[PDB]
Design a binder for this molecule. Structure first.
Ligand SMILES: C[C@]12CC[C@H]3[C@@H](CCC4=CC(=O)CC[C@@H]43)[C@@H]1CC[C@H]2OC(=O)CCC(=O)O
Ligand SMILES: C[C@]12CC[C@H]3[C@@H](CCC4=CC(=O)CC[C@@H]43)[C@@H]1CC[C@H]2OC(=O)CCC(=O)O
Lengths: 125, 125
């Protein structure tokens, strides 16, 4: 139950800001102090300065964000994945990680997680 | 930077017990009191009588479990997905959810999560 369309909107805008590298929109979609678990087995960063200081550090990498499968959203939380098509200084590498989500009931984004690894990455020519 | 071969092994055995509907290999792969989380709304099950009583009740439904994509395993945790092909009161329904994993080293399992929803299900012909 629970229209997953609302939880999916956060994922859209969440990435729409990624694709456009508009952190301002990410922090916007991120509660005043939402929590983000990343990297894995690492330490999250709660707060707008943290969520941004974090998501911002991720934007420092000029890549392309474009989902590929179907976003997942259940209960007040949610989970989705995408691919990062960045470029190197002579080669082109892409990645295929996934992200988690933690809302509070149509009240913007509260917490968030991120899953991936050197196996969900890519290395082609 | 870690070898997911060990963690992924849990996902294998974890499902090998599923494919064989052997709750034993499941609880076996599960610590003496691992932690579960399902379906999606604060419904975990710690201990063995709970993890098994759960993973067992899940086996009560006759379906087919056979991963197809790539399992995910990072740090001491991990995440994977697959598809479920079971039958209904007359038609055949399949399912495409994703599960999570929480280990404590590389010998057995301790905690585990799950993700999906009515969108990751499969109803039709
Ligand atoms: C900083 C980083 C780009 C930004 C992402 C970060 C991993 C965690 C993360 C999760 C998100 O949902 C936003 C992107 C950020 C990545 C880890 C490495 C990196 O970029 C790469 O993928 C490196 C690829 C390479 O070296 O080939
Ligand atoms: C109990 C349950 C079967 C067991 C799984 C549970 C969802 C959570 C779950 C995650 C796992 O990794 C083990 C299976 C359990 C399912 C939710 C519904 C159900 O079975 C169905 O898929 C119902 C399909 C239908 O009739 O539409």
């Amino acid at each position: 139950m629970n229209t997953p369309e609302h939880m999916t909107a956060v994922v859209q805008r969440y990435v729409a800001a990624l694709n456009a590298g508009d952190l301002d929109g990410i922090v916007a979609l991120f509660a005043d102090d939402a929590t983000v678990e990343d990297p894995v087995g690492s330490e999250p960063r709660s707060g707008t300065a943290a969520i941004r200081e974090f998501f911002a550090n991720s934007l420092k990498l000029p890549l392309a964000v474009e989902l590929t499968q179907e976003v997942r959203a259940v209960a007040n939380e949610a989970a989705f994945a995408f691919t990062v098509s960045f470029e190197f200084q002579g080669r082109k590498t892409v990645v295929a990680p996934i992200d988690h989500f933690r809302f509070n009931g149509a009240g913007k984004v509260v917490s968030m997680r991120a899953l991936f690894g050197e196996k969900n990455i890519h290395a082609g020519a």
